[PDB]
Amino acid sequence: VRPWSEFRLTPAEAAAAAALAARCAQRYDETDGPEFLLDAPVIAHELPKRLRTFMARARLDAWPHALVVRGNPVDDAALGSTPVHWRTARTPGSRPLSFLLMLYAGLLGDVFGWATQQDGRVVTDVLPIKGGEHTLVSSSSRQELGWHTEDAFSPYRADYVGLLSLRNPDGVATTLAGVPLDDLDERTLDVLFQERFLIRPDDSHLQVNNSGRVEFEGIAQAADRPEPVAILTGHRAAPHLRVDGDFSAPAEGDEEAAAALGTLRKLIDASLYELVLDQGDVAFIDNRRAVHGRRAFQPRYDGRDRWLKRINITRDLHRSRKAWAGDSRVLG
Numbered sequence: 626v627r628p629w630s631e632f633r634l635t636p637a638e639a640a641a642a643a644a645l646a647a648r649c650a651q652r653y654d655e656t657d658g659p660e661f662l663l664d665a666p667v668i669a670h671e672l673p674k675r676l677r678t679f680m681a682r683a684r685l686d687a688w689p690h691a692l693v694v695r696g697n698p699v700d701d702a703a704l705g706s707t708p709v710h711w712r713t714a715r716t717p718g719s720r721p722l723s724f725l726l727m728l729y730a731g732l733l734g735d736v737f738g739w740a741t742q743q744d745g746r747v748v749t750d751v752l753p754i755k756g757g758e759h760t761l762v763s764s765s766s767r768q769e770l771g772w773h774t775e776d777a778f779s780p781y782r783a784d785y786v787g788l789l790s791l792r793n794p795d796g797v798a799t800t801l802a803g804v805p806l807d808d809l810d811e812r813t814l815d816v817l818f819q820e821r822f823l824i825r826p827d828d829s830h831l832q833v834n835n836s837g838r839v840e841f842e843g844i845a846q847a848a849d850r851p852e853p854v855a856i857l858t859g860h861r862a863a864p865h866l867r868v869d870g871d872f873s874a875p876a877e878g879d880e881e882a883a884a885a886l887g888t889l890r891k892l893i894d895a896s897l898y899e900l901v902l903d904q905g906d907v908a909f910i911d912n913r914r915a916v917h918g919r920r921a922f923q924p925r926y927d928g929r930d931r932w933l934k935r936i937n938i939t940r941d942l943h944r945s946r947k948a949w950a951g952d953s954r955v956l957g
């Protein structure tokens with residue numbers, strides 16, 4: 626038994642999906658261009674039927690922390706070396722796989738980016754950046770990426786975070802945890818459902834981690850003057866989760882909130898588990914049910930580092946209307 630739902634492509638299905646992505650790469654100039662953003666969800670209807678059935682059903686299941694699709698071929702020679710930075714990471718070798726991720730994502734919802742993250746790209750990059758080993762962002766390595774809800778600070782955070790493993794030669798684990806419902810007593814649960822916590826945007830939204838835009842103003846407002854929010858929402862028997870293990874804090878001087886958050890931290894630490902995304906594996910993490918992170922690892926810096934493409938997905942773009950930063954697909 627596993628806490629995520631898993632699908633493995635047959636070689637023929639994987640080949641068909643790859644061919645569709647390659648065709649898109651031939652026909653559109655970029656993945657984040659207006660044209661492909663609009664067309665991808667309909668082109669995705671041509672993906673292998675068994676995969677479409679999996680995506681449609683698994684998303685409606687009550688339990689999974691992620692939807693995992695194994696078996697997409699990746700040829701390291703065609704892919705080329707791991708980029709040294711996200712800025713130069715739209716390499717020709719990675720381009721078809723970026724289209725593939727977008728097509729899969731279009732089966733689950735509306736893709737979007739952030740004006741304040743990797744230049745507002747929709748398909749973003751996860752890779753280790755030399756000098757940035759001990760940071761709190763996804764280009765870290767030697768320091769573990771602590772568990773968190775993606776963009777916890779924001780009402781407009783993704784419903785799903787998609788990850789496509791381009792290479793992962795040393796098998797570094799992604800970490801996941803759900804709400805620790807088997808261990809949270811009722812009183813603690815009660816407190817976590819109340820608006821008694823603070824966050825802050827994570828460091829990926831800092832100007833220094835981009836190559837402004839007015840949207841950085843909103844990040845500052847969120848960091849300097851966070852509004853108290855709940856950590857748990859929805860059904861008490863299956864709550865949605867909004868927390869960042871590093872940045873969450875209790876409301877000022879609220880020791881009962883603090884106790885609940887401390888207990889939560891301990892229970893999530895104790896229940897955190899590993900998912901290894903091997904080369905060609907794709908995961909869609911349910912960002913309402915689960916926190917995620919990434920284990921510490923020693924970076925290589927030899928051209929073959931671990932490298933993922935990544936994408937934020939919402940079930941409803943209109944929920945972030947307020948934050949539509951000039952365009953509906955880049956938020957802030």
Ligand SMILES: N=C(N)NCC[C@H](O)[C@H](N)C(=O)O
Pocket residue numbers: 761762763764770771772773775776827828829869870871872
């Ligand atoms: N490090 C913590 N706890 N949170 C922020 C990490 C996030 O995954 C951020 N969006 C990033 O990609 O680096």
